[PDB]
A paper describes a structure:
There has been a long quest for the structure of the poxvirus DNA polymerase holoenzyme since it has been shown that processive DNA synthesis by VACV E9 requires a cofactor composed of VACV A20 and the viral uracil-DNA glycosylase (UNG), D4. The polymerase E9 is a member of the DNA polymerase family B possessing DNA polymerase and 3’-5’ proofreading exonuclease activities. E9 on its own was shown to be distributive under physiological conditions, adding only few nucleotides per binding event. We present the production in the baculovirus-insect cell system of the VACV DNA polymerase holoenzyme, which consists of the E9 polymerase in combination with its co-factor, the A20-D4 heterodimer.
We first tried to measure a direct interaction between the polymerase subunit E9 and a monomeric mutant of D4, D4KEK, which carries the mutations I197K, V200E and L204K. This mutant does not form dimers in solution as wild-type D4 does. We chose the KEK mutant as we were concerned that the artefactual dimerization of wt D4 in absence of A20 might interfere with the binding studies. The D4KEK structure, which could be determined at a resolution of 1.32 Å, is virtually undistinguishable from wild-type D4, except the dimerization site. As the mutations are distant from the interaction site with E9 they should not interfere with binding. Using BioLayer interferometry (BLI), it was neither possible to observe an interaction between E9 and D4KEK nor between E9 and wild-type D4. We conclude that binding of D4 to E9 in the absence of DNA is too weak to be observed without A20 acting as a linker suggesting that the D4 and E9 interact only transiently.
Numbering used by the authors: 1 to 218
Amino acid sequence: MNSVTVSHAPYTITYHDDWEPVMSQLVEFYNEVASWLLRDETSPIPDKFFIQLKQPLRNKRVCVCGIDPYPKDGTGVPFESPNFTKKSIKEIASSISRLTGVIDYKGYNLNIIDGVIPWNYYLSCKLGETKSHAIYWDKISKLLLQHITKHVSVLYCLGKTDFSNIRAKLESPVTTIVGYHPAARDRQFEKDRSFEKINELLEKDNKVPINWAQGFIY
């Protein structure tokens, strides 16, 4: 790990070596825009905005990406709900239960799966207001997702409206699946074959599949 100083809260960013190439730009861009982020109470809190930068990238094959943190109770870990109450993670767990045949579990966390990096495209929102910080994160969000997609083989984005033009934010032709959000009407996430397709796409690329059952909390 390594640390660098910013001129605004949270003052210090700690990062895994694999993120070094973006850190100079990140510090510059965060110093420019952070006053707009810090006007508001946020999800997550400022001290948690950057905790996913402690994750390695060189062992990652899939990025599972949502647009922004939970509007309340974000932890800094995308999708994480320690008490297993947020609808998104319960719906994801239900999909994985059907795919894997694991019926008995207590929770689910995308951040304990080998080869998967869960991601929030925007790293904060004003508390209670989805997508409220989009304009502020936009340059950082592009910088970070382009860095991720130098490493992963498949990008899976959740939310058709929010990610329809995600290609335009990238600099490579990385394999990208854009599926329904867990809260899409007519229970369209339930029927979505996106999780299953990821391992088909990895196998076609001669990459080891994801063991989705690793996310269960027993």
